[PDB]
Amino acid sequence: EVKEEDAFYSKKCKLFYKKDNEFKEKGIGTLHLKPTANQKTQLLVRADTNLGNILLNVLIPPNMPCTRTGKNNVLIVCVPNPPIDEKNATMPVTMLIRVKTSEDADELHKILLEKKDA
């Protein structure tokens, strides 16, 4: 039987932001998608390491572009919280999520589209 959990979509993955035409590992952790007080979806990512620190906590906006790269890779434009850049703080940054199975990637991208739809 399937256990109960707040987050409907939970899978391990690695975050990576684009800085100076390069990708830097933000921090290994697991993504947790769960509904918020509002009709919107809240995005949260817990650190894989023992230390349970928030890697990225933001709210899926109404307008968000999607970019599916490779087979098991996924890219999305969103505001990093906390923000890495001080000047571009307001402006979002490119983030890439590398999953274990190319299957998880597709699903992850698909869901998002639906989440942003409503």
Side-chain angles (χ1 to χ4, degrees):
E1 271 160 301
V2 293
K3 62 206 279 80
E4 53 158 320
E5 174 174 30
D6 190 315
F8 47 88
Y9 192 74
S10 281
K11 171 77 201 181
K12 71 160 151 184
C13 56
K14 280 183 199 90
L15 272 173
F16 305 92
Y17 43 77
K18 203 153 188 154
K19 272 177 73 272
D20 187 58
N21 299 263
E22 207 170 63
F23 284 85
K24 280 271 165 187
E25 196 204 28
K26 194 274 156 63
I28 306 156
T30 307
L31 162 151
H32 308 281
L33 275 162
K34 67 271 271 281
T36 189
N38 321 305
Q39 205 201 37
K40 294 284 178 79
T41 307
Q42 172 210 295
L43 199 294
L44 179 87
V45 180
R46 170 190 168 80
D48 205 32
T49 190
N50 56 295
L51 208 290
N53 153 63
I54 300 168
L55 286 181
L56 167 77
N57 174 306
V58 296
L59 270 171
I60 298 166
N63 53 302
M64 173 202 126
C66 61
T67 45
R68 269 286 275 91
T69 174
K71 82 209 81 73
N72 61 303
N73 305 118
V74 184
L75 270 151
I76 59 159
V77 180
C78 61
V79 175
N81 300 27
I84 304 150
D85 313 333
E86 285 209 85
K87 297 279 271 85
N88 312 103
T90 59
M91 211 273 161
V93 310
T94 305
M95 283 280 235
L96 196 150
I97 299 168
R98 173 153 161 157
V99 300
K100 205 179 177 175
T101 52
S102 330
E103 149 157 331
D104 204 280
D106 202 337
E107 185 74 313
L108 163 69
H109 171 252
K110 291 196 74 69
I111 300 155
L112 291 160
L113 291 156
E114 276 284 26
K115 304 277 157 199
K116 64 153 199 87
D117 199 65

